[PDB]
Design a protein around this nucleic acid. Structure first.
Ligand SMILES: [Mg+2]
Ligand SMILES: [Zn+2]
Lengths: 1319, 653
RNA sequence: UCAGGCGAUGUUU
DNA sequence: GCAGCTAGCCATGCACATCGCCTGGAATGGGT
DNA sequence: ACCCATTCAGGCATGGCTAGCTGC
C-alpha cells in the first residue's frame, strides 16, 4: 500500500531491519510545552491555573478585605498570522480574568459585607504559538530555544586533587533550590565542617545546627554513638560492642571472665570478634589511666551542688575523674570515635565555634548576610526564618523534592516545598557518611542531574514575576483603601505584567531570531537545546567536562550535530526519538524483552533507570521469531559495553537511527565518515540556500519525507478529497462526502504564499504540485515549498562529478565548475532586500512625500509616478531614487538604493497612522488593495456561496426532486416553497430563513473585513506614514562562491571553463564539476566516494529507462525492468508489487523516474559494497566504478581510469558579492577621526595590533608611519596627502594623530597632568 | 548625536557630569542657608560618591546602574581595557585605501604577482587615476574626472593598467600570527571578484581555500613602494626567520605530479631504446611511442662549477627513465644529475630546491620554483590519479587474525572467571594483546599495499612497488601517512574514553566496511575531546604571544661589537636515550667566543671571532671537538641594545 | 554615528 | 607578647577579523 | 490628557594584601 502521492516516485530502499516505531512528530517539544502552558486545566498543576492559584488570594493587613480568583478566558486574536506578519503587530491574545473582592463585617465575626465580581478584568496580552512552533513578535518570526540546566536538588561533589596540593580530597555538598537561596556544606583540610550561604563566606556548620535551636547534648546524641562506663569496684568497667574494635589496634589485655583472647598490644581478628559476640561478654574492666584521652558526652554537674564541673565535648583527665567521682557519677557516657570509620569531625568543629547559644548564632548569621549593622533580635529572627522556611522566598518544586528524597533513600516522592530540620540534618549525615568511606560522589554530566525546560516553563515563570510585582501595589492600595468605592479593575494595573512578558519574548539570551533560509534550518533551530542563558553556565566558565559527551547522551542528545568554535558542546542538538519525561528528564524509547522474545512493546526510559538494566544494540541479528540468532551478543550495561549471555538482556534498541539528530541523519553513508567531517557536514547542510528550481537528491536517507511534511513550510491538505481548481495562487479542494461535517460545510481553500521575504533575505515561495482533477488523501502535500519537491527535502542539486587533479585549478579544495552549470541556471539563487523610508512630523514642520527635487531633472525623476513612490517593476540600480521625501525648509531627505545593490522592485507597502490623509498613490494602492480584498475574501466567499447553492438546491434536488419544476427557475426560489411538507419542506423553510440571515451575514462579514483593512494601526510616536520597498536581485554563480557536499568537503568555486575543456568520456557527455582527490585520504571521510558510486548506479537505471521511453516502447518492458530494479538487493524490507498499478499509473512513474531512480540508505543500516556492485551491473556500467575520460584540450586518454559519478552538492550562502568590498576615501568617524567600520557604512579594514607587530618585524618603517598617520588619523596631513597625490607628487607629512590628542585630553580630564616637553 | 528622529543617545559622560553638577548645586544651596548638619553630611557624602562614579565607576562597592540595567562607562573605562584607546585607536587602527575579499587559486602566475579584482582596483586607486587623467588633459578638474570614473568609459581601464603597472600592494590574512603573514605583490588585473593568489604561498599564509578572506592595502608614498619592493615581496622571503628552513616547500598536487612523473615501472612501451637528449625524450612522450615511465638510457649533459666560479660541462650516458629526463629539461645549470634520479618524494623535492638555493644564489631558485610548479601541475593532471573504493585493499588475513585474538581474549577471561588473576593484570593483559593484534594487522595491510603490483617482464613474473592511488598519495608525502592509511584499511585501534582510561574492546572494523553504532559512538568522544580543545587552545596561545612581544620590544641591535670575552658553553643534548640534537645544529651560525683548541693542546683550530657556518661546522666534526664556547645574547655587554656579533646569523638571510 | 545580545564565519593539521 | 607564617578577601586577565540582525531614557507629575 | 519640569551566581591562577597565630 502507499499514500497516493508516493505512488508518483516511489523511492527504492536498501535496508535490513524492520522498523517498529515510526519517526515521531518532530516538534513535540515546542507544541506540547506551550499547549500545556495555556490550557484550562483543573487542580492547579502546571498552567496559568498554577500561577494564579499560587499567588492568590491577596488579603489586606488583616483588614478583612480580600481578593480571590475565579477563572480566566482568552479572546480570539485581533488579527491572524499572515496579516500579522504583513503589518507588524505581535500575534497576541487578550487576557481576561474573573476576580472576586470581599469584605467582612468590620468589628464583628466574618460577616461578608459585599462581594462584587468585576467581569473579566483585563490584564494584558501574551503571544501565541503558530501551528509551526514559532512566535511572532514584531512582524518578524522568533523562536525560543529550550534550556538545559541543573536539576533543582542536592549534590555531592569531590573537587579532588587540585586544591591544597596536599594530595587530600574534599567533599562538598550543595542544595540548589528552584527559587531562592543556595546552601553549601564543605570541609577544610583540617577536617572542619563549614556551612556557607549564597557563596558569601565561611561559617562553622554547627553554627547553623545550633541556630536550629539544638542544645549541644542533643547534637552529640544525634550524630555520634555512645560508650558506657560504670564506677564499679575500680577501673570503671565498660560496655563494648565488639565490632567497634576491629579498626582500632589495642594497647591492653583482652579477656573474657578471665578467659583471655588477646594480650596487650596487637590488633583484633574477626574470628575473635565472632567468638566474643558468641560469648556476649562485654562488661569488662579497663585500664583507667587511658580513658583520659577521650571526650565527654554531656554535662555532668554535681548530683548535689551542680557546680560548673564539665562542659560537654571536653577532653578528660584523672583529676576531673576524681572531681566528678566525689559524688560518684556511676554512669559516664562518651562518644565512640574511630579514626578510620567514624571521626570526630563535628566535635572538633563545635570546638572551633565562636558562639554558645541560639541568639548569638542568629546574630552571627545576620551579620554575615548584612555587613555593618547592629542586629535587632527579632529582626535577625525574621531574616533567618525567611531564607529556609517561608513559602514565599524559597521553593523547591515537585522536581526538587523527588530528586532530593531519591538521593537520600527516603520513601516517598511527594512532600513539602520547603526545607526542614530533618532534611538539613540528613544531608549532613550523608556528607559525613561519604567522608567516612561509603557511598559515592555523583557527577554533574549524568543526564539524571540535568534537565530540560521549555517555552512553557519560561513564560510561566516570567509571568509569575509579573504577578508578584503587581501584588505589592495591590496590597498597598488595599491597605490604604476604603469601602468598596472602587471596583477590582482599578486596583490591578496590567502594565507591569505586559511589560515583563514582552521583555521576555523580545529580549532574551534565549528568544532569538529564527534561522529561516531552509526547511531543515527551521526544524533544527526549533529542536535546539542550549546550556546558556540565565540560570546556566556561560561561555567563559565552562570547563571541559560539560563540553565532553558523557556516556548517557546515547540516544537522547546527539553526539555529532553541534557548532564548532567558541561554544562547542553547549549547543547540543536533540535526538530523533527523544522525548521529555513528566518531570523533564530526557527519555528515549526501547523495546521490552521477555524471557527470550523481542516484543514489539515500546517502553520509555530516563537516564538513571537505564543504569540498572542491560540493553541490546540496534543491529543484532534476530530471526523471525523474537530470538537472537546467536547466543551471546554485544550490549551495554552501566556506561560500559561488553558481550553478554543470551538470557540476560532486558531491553533492545528501537531502530538504528536513534543515536543521531535530524541534523545528521540526512547524511548517506554516515557510518563511513570520521566524526569530524560528519560534524562539519551536518552544519554546512544546515546552511544551504533554496535554489531556483528544486530537485530531489539522488542518494538520500528516507528521512526527507518526514522533515518536509512535518516542518511547516509546505501546504498539507487537511481533509481528503478531490482538487477542483488549481492556480499558482490558490488551490481549491472539494471535500469528499464522509469526511464532511453535516451542516452546510462546503469546501477548502489554501492560499499558497507567493514571493516574500525570509529572515535571511533569501526567497520563500510555494508551488502547486498537483494537477486539476485528481484525488488527494488526508495528510498529504499540495504545494512544494522552498527547497522541496513532491514532498521531499531537496537542498542542492545533483551534478556529475569526476575526481582528478586538473591543471592546478583545484589546488586545495577549489571545486572547478563547467559553464554548463551556469548556463542552465541550476544554481541561480534568488534574494530580496527590504529598504525603508519613514516620515516624522517634527519641530520646524511636517514632511510630505512629493516628487519635487532640486539638482536633478526628469532624466532621473521619470521612474517615479506623479505621486512620488516608484512604479512596481522598474529595474532600478545603485543611486536611483525610490521615494521622494521632503523636509521643511525645503531640504531633501529622500531615499535611494544604496550603492552596489541592484534590484527589480516587486512590492510596496504603505502604513499610515490613523488620523492622517492618504495622498495620491496611497489612494491608488489603497483602492487596489480594496479590489484585492474584495476579489480575495469576497470572491472566496463567492465560490463558497456557489458550492452552498449547490448543496441547498440539492436539498431541492436529491430525493423528492423537482426536475422540471426546478430547472426552469434560477437557483433563487427556495424560501417560501410548498412541497412535500415533511423534513424536506421543514428544511427548506427554516434553512432559507437562515439563509437570508446568511446574506446579511455575508454582508456584515465583508464589512468587518473592509473595516479592518481600512483602520490605520499604530506606529512609533511622532511618525506619520511609512513607505517600504522590496527588491529582488538574482545571483548567478561566479569565482568565489562556496559550494559544499554533504560530507564536509567545502570548497570555493575557482574557475568557469568552457564546455570544450571539460574531461569528456568515450560517449560524449562532459563532466560538470571536478574536485580534488588528494582531499580524501587525509580528512578520513571515505564516505563521499560511496555516495558517488551509488549515484552513478542511479543515473544508470535512469538513462536506461530514458531510452526505453524515448523509443516509445510498450509497457510490458517497463513493468519488467522497473520491477527488477526494485527487487534486487539481498533481503530488504522494501516490497513493491508493481503489478498492482493502473497501466496509466506506471507511465507516469516512468515519467518521473527518467531523471534517476532515487535511492535510500537508512543511516547505520546502509547499502553494502556487494549490493552497489550488483546494482551497477543491473545497469551497464563497469563494476569497478571507474571510467576512462579523455581530455578536452589535447583529446588524449588520461593515463589510467578515473572516478566519475553523481553527487549532491549545495550552494552555501557566503556569496562573494556580499563579501567583497573596497574603499578609497569617504565617511570618517566623529569622536576619533578614524574611518568607520563595516560594509553598509562605507568603511575600511582594521590594521590591527598583530599586523603592526609584523611590519615592525620587517625593517619597514615608512609603511608603518604612513598607515598610522596619513591613511587614518592626521586630519591636516590626510587632506594634504590627497592633494599631492592628484598633483603627481608622492610624499607625506607626518603631523600628529588626533586619536593621541584625544588620549591627552581625557587623561588631562582626570586629575593627572600630561604634557609634551620641549627640545 | 541626533539618532533616527529627534531623540538623542545619552552618552555616559554627559550623564555622569550632569549628575555631579546637580548634586553640587544642591550642596551650594544648602550652604546658603546654614541648614543642619545631618543634612549637610548626607549631601557631602552623596557628592563624594558621585564624583567617585565619574572618575571610576564600579570601584567603590557597587557600581551605579546605567539608564537601563547595566553599568555605565566612566573615564577610567574609557582608557583601560580591551576597548579603551590604547588598544582600540592607538596601537592598531582603521585605515583608508583598503579592501577585502575572498581568495581563489590561479596557477598561472609567476610567484611574484597576485591576481586582483578589477572593480576592487578601480575603487582602490581612484586618486592616482584622477592624477594621470588631468595629466593627459582628458579632463578639467576633480569633479569632471569623478564623473569619468563613475561612468567607466573606454579610457579609464587603459589608464588603470598604466598606473597598476609596477606598483606593489600588500596582501594580508586575518589572524596574522607571524611576520610572514603580510606580503607584497604586483597586481595583475582580472575579471571576477576574487583575489587570485599564487599557490606556492598558501603554505606560508596557512590559507586553505575553504572560503578564507584576505585584505589588500595600498602603499602610497614613494619610500613605501620601495619598501614593499625591497623587504616584503615574496621573492625575498624564502627562509623563515624561525629556523632557516625553506618556506616555498611545494605542496600536495605539485608533488603528486612530480612523483608520478618520475618513477620506474618494469615493462612499458619503449624499453631499452636509447635517446639523444631530453628533447627527444619529450618528443617521444608526446607522440605516444614510449611511456612516461620506462627504464631507458640517455645521453645527458651536466655542468659542474668546480673552477673558481667557472662552469665546466661533461656528458655521459646515464640510466634513467623518460619522464625523469623530461623533468631534467628544467633544472638550472649547475646541479649534479643525481638530484632527480631517485623517486622524488616530498622531502626529496625540498632537498632539491634547497641545494639549488645554496649553490646558485637567488634568481635561479625563484625561477626554478615556478617551473617546478608548472610542470608539476601539468603532468599530474595528465596522469589522472583518482581514488575509488576498489583501491583500499583489505588484507585477506584480517578476519583470521582478529578471530585468533578474540580467542585469546576469551582465554584470559576464563583464567579470571575461575579466579586465578587480579582484575588489574587482567585489564593490562587484554589491552596488551589487542595492541599486538593491531600491529600484526597493520603490518599485513601495509605489505599487501606496497608490494601489491606483480607483473611480467617479457619473462614470467616480478614484483615492484605499486601504483595503487592511495598508496601513491601516501608514499609521496602529499597527504596522510601510515597512520591514516591504516585507519582506512585495517582496524582503527583502541579509542580512549573521556577521562583518560582506555576502553577494553577495540573498534574491530575500519572505514571501508561500516561501523555498527556503538563503535561509532565511542569514536565520537574520542574526537570531540580534541576538537573542543582546539578553541581554548587558540585563545590562550594568542595571549601568550601578546605578552611575549610586550617584553621583548625595545630590543634593537644597536652597536656593532661589544667586544667581550664572556659567553656560554654548548654541548649536544643527551637525554639518557640517544642524543637528540647534534652539536652541529646547535652551533650553526653563531659567533664563537674563545679560540677552540684542537684536543692536541696548543694547536689553535679556530679564531675567537669567527662566524661558524657550514664548512666550519664540518671542521668541528673533523676534529670532533664537542664542547664549544660561544657568545650568547644573555651575556652581551651593551647599553640599551644588543651588539651584532652577539646575535649570530640572521636566519632568512 | 554610540553601547549590549545572538548567530555565523574563519583560525580544521 | 613580638615576629615570621599561614590563611581568607579582593584585583587583575582571559585571541583576532568579519558579517549580519536587532535593540536600545525614562519617571513621575505638571498647566491649560 | 501631552510633551516636557526635576530625578532614578559551576574559575582560576596568581598575586597582592591584611589579620591572626603560635615559635620564642
Ligand atoms: Mg579554512
Ligand atoms: Zn655582545
Amino acid at each position: 500500500v502507499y499514500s497516493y502521492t508516493e505512488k508518483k516516485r516511489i523511492r527504492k530502499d536498501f535496508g535490513k531491519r524492520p522498523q517498529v516505531l515510526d519517526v515521531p512528530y518532530l516538534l513535540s517539544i515546542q507544541l506540547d510545552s506551550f499547549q500545556k502552558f495555556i490550557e484550562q486545566d483543573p487542580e492547579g498543576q502546571y498552567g496559568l491555573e498554577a500561577a494564579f492559584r499560587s499567588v492568590f488570594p491577596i488579603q489586606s493587613y488583616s483588614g478583612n478585605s480580600e481578593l480571590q480568583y475565579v477563572s480566566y478566558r482568552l479572546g480570539e486574536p485581533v488579527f491572524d498570522v499572515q496579516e500579522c506578519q504583513i503589518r507588524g503587530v505581535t500575534y497576541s491574545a487578550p487576557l481576561r480574568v474573573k476576580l472576586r473582592l470581599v469584605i467582612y463585617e468590620r468589628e464583628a465575626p466574618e460577616g461578608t459585607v459585599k462581594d462584587i465580581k468585576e467581569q473579566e478584568v483585563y490584564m494584558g496580552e501574551i503571544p501565541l504559538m503558530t501551528d509551526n512552533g514559532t512566535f511572532v513578535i514584531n512582524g518578524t518570526e522568533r523562536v525560543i530555544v529550550s534550556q538545559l540546566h541543573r536539576s533543582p536538588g542536592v549534590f555531592f561533589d569531590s573537587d579532588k586533587g587540585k586544591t591544597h596540593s596536599s594530595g587530600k580530597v574534599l567533599y562538598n555538598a550543595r542544595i540548589i533550590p528552584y527559587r531562592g537561596s543556595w546552601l553549601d556544606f564543605e570541609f577544610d583540610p583540617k577536617d572542619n565542617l563549614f556551612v556557607r550561604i549564597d557563596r558569601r563566606r565561611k561559617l562553622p556548620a554547627t553554627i547553623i545546627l545550633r541556630a536550629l535551636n539544638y542544645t549541644t547534648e542533643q547534637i552529640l546524641d544525634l550524630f555520634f554513638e555512645k560508650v558506657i562506663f560504670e564506677i564499679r569496684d575500680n577501673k570503671l568497667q565498660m560496655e563494648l560492642v565488639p565490632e567497634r574494635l576491629r579498626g582500632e589496634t589495642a594497647s591492653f589485655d583482652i579477656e573474657a571472665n578471665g578467659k583471655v583472647y588477646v594480650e596487650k598490644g596487637r590488633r583484633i581478628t574477626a574470628r575473635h570478634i565472632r567468638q566474643l559476640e558468641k560469648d556476649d561478654v562485654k562488661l569488662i574492666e579497663v585500664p583507667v589511666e587511658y580513658i583520659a584521652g577521650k571526650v565527654v558526652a554531656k554535662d555532668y554537674i554535681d548530683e548535689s551542688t551542680g557546680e560548673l564541673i564539665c562542659a560537654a565535648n571536653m577532653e578528660l583527665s584523672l583529676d576531673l575523674l576524681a572531681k566528678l567521682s566525689q559524688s560518684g557519677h556511676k554512669r559516664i557516657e562518651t562518644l565512640f570515635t574511630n579514626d578510620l570509620d567514624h571521626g570526630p569531625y563535628i566535635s572538633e568543629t563545635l570546638r572551633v565555634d565562636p558562639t554558645n547559644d541560639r541568639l548569638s548564632a542568629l546574630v552571627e548569621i545576620y551579620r554575615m548576610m548584612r555587613p555593618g549593622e547592629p542586629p535587632t533580635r527579632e529582626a535577625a529572627e525574621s531574616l533567618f526564618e525567611n531564607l529556609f522556611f517561608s513559602e514565599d522566598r524559597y521553593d523547591l518544586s515537585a522536581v526538587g523534592r523527588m530528586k532530593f528524597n531519591r538521593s537520600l533513600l527516603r520513601e516517598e516522592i511527594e512532600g513539602s516545598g520547603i526545607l526542614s530540620k530533618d532534611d538539613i540534618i540528613d544531608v549532613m549525615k550523608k556528607l559525613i557518611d561519604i567522608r567516612n568511606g561509603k557511598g559515592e560522589v555523583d557527577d554533574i554530566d549524568h543526564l539524571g542531574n540535568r534537565r530540560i525546560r521549555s517555552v512553557g516553563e519560561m513564560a510561566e515563570n516570567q509571568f509569575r514575576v509579573g504577578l508578584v510585582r503587581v501584588e505589592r501595589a495591590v496590597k498597598e492600595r488595599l491597605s490604604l483603601g476604603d469601602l468598596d468605592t472602587l471596583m477590582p479593575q482599578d486596583m490591578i494595573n496590567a502594565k507591569p505584567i505586559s511589560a515583563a512578558v514582552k521583555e521576555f519574548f523580545g529580549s532574551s539570551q534565549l528568544s532569538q531570531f529564527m534561522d529561516q533560509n531552509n526547511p531543515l534550518s527551521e526544524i533544527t533551530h526549533k529542536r535546539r537545546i542550549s546550556a546558556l542563558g540565565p540560570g546556566g553556565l556561560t561561555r567563559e566558565r565552562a570547563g571541559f567536562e560539560v563540553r565532553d559527551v558523557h556516556p548517557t547522551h546515547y540516544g537522547r542528545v546527539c553526539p555529532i550535530e553541534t557548532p564548532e568554535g567558541p561554544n562547542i558542546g553547549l549547543i547540543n542538538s536533540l535526538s530523533v526519538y527523544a522525548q521529555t519525561n513528566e518531570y523533564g528528564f530526557l527519555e528515549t524509547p526501547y523495546r521490552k524483552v521477555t524471557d527470550g522474545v523481542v516484543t514489539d512493546e515500546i517502553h520509555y526510559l530516563s537516564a538513571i533507570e537505564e543504569g540498572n538494566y542491560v540493553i541490546a544494540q540496534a543491529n543484532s541479528n534476530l530471526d523471525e521469531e523474537g530470538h537472537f540468532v546467536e547466543d551471546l551478543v554485544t550490549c551495554r550495561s552501566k556506561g560500559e559495553s561488553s558481550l553478554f549471555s543470551r538470557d540476560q538482556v532486558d531491553y533492545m534498541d528501537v531502530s538504528t537511527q536513534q543515536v543521531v539528530s535530524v541534523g545528521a541523519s540526512l547524511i548517506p553513508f554516515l557510518e563511513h565518515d570520521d566524526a569530524n567531517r560528519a560534524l562539519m557536514g551536518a552544519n554546512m547542510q544546515r546552511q544551504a540556500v533554496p535554489t531556483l528550481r528544486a530537485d530531489k537528491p539522488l542518494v538520500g536517507t528516507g528521512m526527507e519525507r518526514a522533515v518536509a511534511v512535518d516542518s511547516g513550510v509546505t501546504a498539507v491538505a487537511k481533509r481528503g478529497g478531490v482538487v477542483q481548481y488549481v492556480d499558482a495562487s490558490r488551490i481549491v479542494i472539494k471535500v469528499n462526502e464522509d469526511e464532511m461535517y453535516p451542516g452546510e460545510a462546503g469546501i477548502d481553500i489554501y492560499n499558497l504564499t507567493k514571493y516574500t521575504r525570509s529572515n535571511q533575505n533569501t526567497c520563500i515561495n510555494q508551488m502547486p504540485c498537483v494537477s486539476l482533477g485528481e484525488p488527494v488523501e488526508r495528510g498529504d502535500v499540495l504545494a512544494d515549498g522552498p527547497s522541496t519537491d513532491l514532498g521531499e527535502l531537496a537542498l542542492g542539486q545533483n551534478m556529475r562529478v569526476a575526481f582528478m587533479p586538473w591543471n592546478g585549478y583545484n589546488f586545495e579544495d577549489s571545486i572547478l565548475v563547467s559553464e554548463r552549470v551556469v548556463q542552465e541556471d541550476r544554481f541561480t539563487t534568488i534574494h530580496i532586500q527590504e529598504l525603508a523610508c519613514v516620515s516624522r512630523d517634527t519641530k520646524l514642520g511636517p514632511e510630505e512625500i512629493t516628487a519635487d527635487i532640486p539638482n536633478v531633472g526628469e532624466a532621473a525623476l521619470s521612474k517615479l509616478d506623479e505621486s512620488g513612490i516608484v512604479y512596481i517593476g522598474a529595474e532600478v540600480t545603485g543611486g536611483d531614487i525610490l521615494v521622494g521625501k521632503v523636509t521643511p525648509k525645503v531640504k531633501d531627505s529622500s531615499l535611494r538604493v544604496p550603492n552596489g545593490v541592484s534590484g527589480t522592485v516587486i512590492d510596496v507597502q504603505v502604513f499610515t497612522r490613523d488620523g492622517v490623509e492618504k495622498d495620491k498613490r496611497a489612494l491608488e494602492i489603497e483602492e487596489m488593495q480594496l479590489k484585492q480584498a474584495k476579489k480575495d475574501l469576497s470572491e472566496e466567499l463567492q465560490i463558497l456561496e456557489a458550492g452552498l447553492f449547490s448543496r441547498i438546491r440539492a436539498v431541492l434536488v436529491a430525493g423528492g426532486v423537482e426536475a422540471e419544476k426546478l430547472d426552469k427557475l434560477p437557483r433563487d426560489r427556495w424560501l417560501e416553497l410548498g412541497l412535500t411538507d415533511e423534513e424536506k419542506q421543514n428544511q427548506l423553510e427554516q434553512l432559507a430563513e437562515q439563509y437570508d440571515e446568511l446574506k446579511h451575514e455575508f454582508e456584515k462579514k465583508l464589512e468587518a473585513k473592509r473595516r479592518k483593512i481600512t483602520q490605520g494601526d499604530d506606529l512609533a510616536p511622532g511618525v506619520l506614514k511609512i513607505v517600504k520597498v522590496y527588491l529582488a536581485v538574482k545571483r548567478r554563480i561566479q569565482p568565489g562562491d562556496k559550494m559544499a557536499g554533504r560530507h564536509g568537503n567545502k570548497g570555493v568555486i575557482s574557475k568557469i571553463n568552457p564546455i570544450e575543456d571539460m574531461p569528456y568520456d568515450e560517449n560524449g557527455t562532459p563532466v560538470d564539476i571536478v574536485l580534488n582527490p588528494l582531499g580524501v585520504p587525509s580528512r578520513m571521510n571515505i564516505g563521499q566516494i560511496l555516495e558517488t558510486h551509488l549515484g552513478m548506479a542511479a543515473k544508470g537505471i535512469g538513462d536506461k529507462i530514458n531510452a526505453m521511453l524515448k523509443q516509445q516502447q510498450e509497457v510490458a518492458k517497463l513493468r519488467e525492468f522497473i520491477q527488477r530494479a526494485y527487487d534486487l538487493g539481498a533481503d530488504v524490507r522494501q516490497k513493491v508489487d508493481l503489478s498492482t498499478f493502473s497501466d496509466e499509473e506506471v507511465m507516469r512513474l516512468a515519467e518521473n523516474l527518467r531523471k534517476g531512480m532515487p535511492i535510500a540508505t537508512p543511516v547505520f543500516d546502509g547499502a553494502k559494497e556487494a549490493e552497489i556492485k550488483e546494482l551497477l551491473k543491473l545497469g551497464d556500467l563497469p563494476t569497478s566504478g571507474q571510467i576512462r575520460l579523455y581530455d578536452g584540450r589535447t583529446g588524449e586518454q588520461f593515463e589510467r581510469p578515473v572516478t566519475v559519478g553523481y553527487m549532491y552538492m549545495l550552494k552555501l550562502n557566503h556569496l562573494v558579492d556580499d563579501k567583497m568590498h573596497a574603499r578609497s576615501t569617504g565617511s570618517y568617524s566623529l569622536v576619533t577621526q578614524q574611518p568607520l567600520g563595516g560594509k553598509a557604512q562605507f568603511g575600511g579594514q582594521r590594521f590591527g595590533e598583530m599586523e603592526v607587530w609584523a611590519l615592525e618585524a620587517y625593517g619597514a618603517a615608512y609603511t608603518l608611519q604612513e598607515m598610522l598617520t596619513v591613511k587614518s588619523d592626521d586630519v591636516n596631513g590626510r587632506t594634504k596627502m590627497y592633494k599631492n597625490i592628484v598633483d603627481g607628487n608622492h610624499q607625506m607629512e607626518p603631523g600628529m594623530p588626533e586619536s593621541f590628542n584625544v588620549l591627552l585630553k581625557e587623561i588631562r580630564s582626570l586629575g593627572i597632568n600630561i604634557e609634551l616637553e620641549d627640545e | 548625536v541626533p539618532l533616527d528622529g529627534g531623540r538623542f543617545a545619552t552618552s555616559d559622560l554627559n550623564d555622569l557630569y550632569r549628575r555631579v553638577i546637580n548634586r553640587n548645586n544642591r550642596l551650594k544651596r544648602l550652604l546658603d542657608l546654614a541648614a543642619p548638619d545631618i543634612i549637610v553630611r548626607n549631601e557631602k557624602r552623596m557628592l563624594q560618591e558621585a564624583v567617585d562614579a565619574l572618575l571610576d565607576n564600579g570601584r567603590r562597592g557597587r557600581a551605579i546602574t546605567g539608564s537601563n540595567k547595566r553599568p555605565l562607562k566612566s573615564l577610567a573605562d574609557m582608557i583601560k581595557g580591551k576597548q579603551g584607546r590604547f588598544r582600540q585607536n592607538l596601537l592598531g587602527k582603521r585605515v583608508d585605501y583598503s579592501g577585502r575579499s575572498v581568495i581563489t587559486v590561479g596557477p598561472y602566475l609567476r610567484l611574484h604577482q597576485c591576481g586582483l579584482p578589477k572593480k576592487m582596483a578601480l575603487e582602490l586607486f581612484k586618486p592616482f587615476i584622477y592624477g594621470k587623467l588631468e595629466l593627459r588633459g582628458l579632463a578639467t578638474t576633480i569633479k569632471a574626472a569623478k564623473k569619468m570614473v563613475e561612468r567607466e568609459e573606454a579610457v579609464v581601464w587603459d589608464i588603470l593598467d598604466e598606473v597598476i603597472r609596477e606598483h606593489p600592494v600588500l596582501l594580508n590574512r586575518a589572524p596574522t600570527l607571524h611576520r610572514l603573514g603580510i606580503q607584497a605583490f604586483e597586481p595583475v588585473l582580472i575579471e571576477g571578484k576574487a583575489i587570485q593568489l599564487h599557490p606556492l604561498v598558501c603554505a606560508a599564509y596557512n590559507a586553505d581555500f575553504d572560503g578564507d578572506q584576505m585584505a589588500v592595502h595600498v602603499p602610497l608614498t614613494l619610500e613605501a613602494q620601495l619598501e614593499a619592493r625591497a623587504l616584503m615581496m615574496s621573492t625575498n622571503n624564502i627562509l623563515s626567520p624561525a629556523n632557516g628552513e625553506p618556506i616555498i616547500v611545494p605542496s600536495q598536487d605539485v608533488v603528486l605530479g612530480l612523483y608520478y612523473m618520475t618513477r620506474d615501472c618494469v615493462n612499458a612501451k619503449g624499453e631499452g631504446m636509447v635517446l639523444t637528449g631530453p628533447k627527444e625524450a619529450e618528443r617521444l612522450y608526446r607522440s605516444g611511442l614510449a611511456s612516461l615511465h620506462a627504464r631507458v638510457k640517455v645521453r645527458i649533459t651536466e655542468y659542474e662549477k668546480d673552477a673558481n666560479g667557472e662552469l665546466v660541462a661533461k656528458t655521459s650516458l646515464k640510466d634513467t627513465t623518460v619522464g625523469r629526463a623530461i623533468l631534467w629539461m628544467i633544472v638550472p645549470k649547475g646541479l649534479p644529475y643525481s638530484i632527480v634520479n631517485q623517486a622524488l618524494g616530498k622531502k626529496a623535492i625540498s632537498k632539491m630546491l634547497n641545494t639549488c638555493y645554496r649553490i646558485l644564489g637567488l634568481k635561479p631558485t625563484v625561477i626554478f620554483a615556478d617551473q617546478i610548479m608548472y610542470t608539476g601541475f601539468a603532468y599530474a593532471a595528465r596522469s589522472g590519479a583518482s581514488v575509488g573504493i576498489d583501491d583500499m585493499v583489505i588484507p585477506e588475513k584480517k578476519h583470521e587474525i582478529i578471530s585468533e585474538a578474540e580467542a585469546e581474549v576469551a582465554e584470559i577471561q576464563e583464567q579470571f572467571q575461575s579466579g586465578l588473576v587480579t582484575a588489574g593484570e587482567r585489564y593490562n593483559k587484554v589491552i596488551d594483546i589487542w595492541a599486538a593484534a593491531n600491529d600484526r594487522v597493520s603490518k599485513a595491510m601495509m605489505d599487501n599495499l606496497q608490494t601489491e603490483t606483480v607483473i611480467n617482464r617479457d619473462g614470467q613474473e616480478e614484483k615492484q612497488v605499486s601504483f595503487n592511488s592511495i598508496y601513491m598519495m601516501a608514499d609521496s608525502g602529499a597527504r596522510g601517512s601510515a597512520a591514516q592509511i591504516r585507519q582506512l584499511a585495517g582496524m582503527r585501534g583502541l579509542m580512549a574514553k573521556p577521562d583518560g582510561s582506555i576502553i577494553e574492546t577495540p573498534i574491530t572494523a575500519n572505514f571501508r566496511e561500516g561501523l555498527n553504532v556503538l563503535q561509532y559512538f565511542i569514536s565520537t568522544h574520542g574526537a570531540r575531546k580534541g576538537l573542543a580543545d582546539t578553541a581554548l587552545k587558540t585563545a590562550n596561545s594568542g595571549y601568550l604571544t601578546r605578552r611575549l612581544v610586550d617584553v621583548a620590544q625595545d630590543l634593537v641591535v644597536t652597536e656593532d661589537d661589544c667586544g667581550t670575552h664572556e659567553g656560554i658553553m654548548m654541548t649536544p643534548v643527551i637525554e639518557g636515550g640517544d642524543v637528540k640534537e647534534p652539536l652541529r645544529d646547535r652551533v650553526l651560525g653563531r659567533v664563537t667566543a674563545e679560540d677552540v683548541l684542537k684536543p692536541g693542546t696548543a694547536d689553535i683550530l679556530v679564531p675567537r671571532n669567527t662566524l661558524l657556518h657550514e664548512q666550519w661546522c664540518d671542521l668541528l666534526e673533523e676534529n670532533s671537538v664537542d664542547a664549544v664556547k660561544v657568545r650568547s645574547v644573555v651575556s652581551c655587554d651593551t647599553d640599551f641594545g644588543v651588539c651584532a656579533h652577539c646575535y649570530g646569523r640572521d636566519l632568512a638571510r
